[model samples]
Target: MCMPCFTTDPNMAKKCRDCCGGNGKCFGPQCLCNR
Candidate 1:
């Protein structure tokens, strides 16, 4: 399962995104990370 990065908030956005495993990328709320 893919994890979520709370990118909705300005502060938490970078935090969550940076913490995404596999160096995932979140686009439009979709965690297009590890399959």
Candidate 2:
């Protein structure tokens, strides 16, 4: 499955970006955030 980072708060533009260090799209198991 193509799993990507998922975030509920769409306003978290900078917050979630730092989670994966802008190196990847998928963070953990949630899919729907990073492209």
Q: Write the per-residue lDDT of candidate 1 for residues 1-35, one digit (tens) a residue.
A: 15565666776555445556536566665555533
Index of the highest-TM-score prediction: 1
- In model 2, the runs with Cα more than 4 Å from the true position are 1-11, 23-35
TM-score of each prediction: 0.35, 0.27
What local lDDT does model 1 show for residue 27? 64
Instruction: Give candidate 1's whole-model lDDT.
Output: 0.55
lDDT tens digits by residue: candidate 2, 1-35: 22344465674534455555543344454433444
List the lowest-lDDT window of 10 residues for candidate 1: 13-22
Clashing pairs in 2: none
Rate residue 14 of model 2 by lDDT.
45
- TM-score of model number 1: 0.35
